[PDB]
């Protein structure tokens, strides 16, 4: 039991440590989406001419690629964490067979948040892009709310197993 509980503490910390990599990546997904919402709000105004909405669109297309680059590139121990495929993954959080905690992380790609192809060439579409990026802030809030509540189980688990 003592040897096993010390691996369970080490695995619950290996779990906290993984979670922080995902959580801290979605912190820049927020900071990209806070920028896409502010860019979309600015491009929505019909005092903008056409050239000056395609000038916004260049930053929205580049920032949407950066949300997909955060997603496909963030890894822990070579596993991708927020590409949608960190699901059904388990922490062995005790001394016995199958004393799990489960880590699941919904897709955080620009497709998984619906910010692939935010179109900001008119008031109608640039408001559609405000709506999409505020939903994506709401999704990244809800996913970081799970990864945060989960780090709070594991801080209590490590306090308990130790």
């Amino acid at each position: 039991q003592v040897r096993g509980l010390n691996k369970a503490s080490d695995n619950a910390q290996d779990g906290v440590s993984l979670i922080q990599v995902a959580e801290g990546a979605l912190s820049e997904t927020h900071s990209i989406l806070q920028r896409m919402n502010e860019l979309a709000t600015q491009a929505a105004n019909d005092t903008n001419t056409t050239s000056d909405r395609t000038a916004v669109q260049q930053e929205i297309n580049q920032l949407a690629s950066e949300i997909t680059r955060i997603a496909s590139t963030t890894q822990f121990n070579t596993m991708n964490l927020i590409d949608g495929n960190f699901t059904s993954k388990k922490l062995q959080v005790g001394s016995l067979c199958g004393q799990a905690i489960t880590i699941d992380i919904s897709d955080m790609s620009a497709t998984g948040l619906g910010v692939s192809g935010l179109v900001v060439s008119s008031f109608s579409a640039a408001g559609k892009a405000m709506s999409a990026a505020q939903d994506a802030i709401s999704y990244v809030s809800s996913m970081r709310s799970k990864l945060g509540a989960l780090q709070n189980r594991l801080e209590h688990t490590i306090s308990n197993l130790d």
Partner: protein
Amino acid sequence: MVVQHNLTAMNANRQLGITTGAQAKSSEKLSSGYKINRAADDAAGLTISEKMRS
């Protein structure tokens, strides 16, 4: 006492860790200037703050 398990020390080590934990999670708020750095700090405080930032 037992020579093989200084449990006076092992408990003191366990409590030292709990304290350096609280220290590293406080020092984070002063170097950054934010009270919620990570959603593990406050899941509503995060979710609400991102709407107020928005």
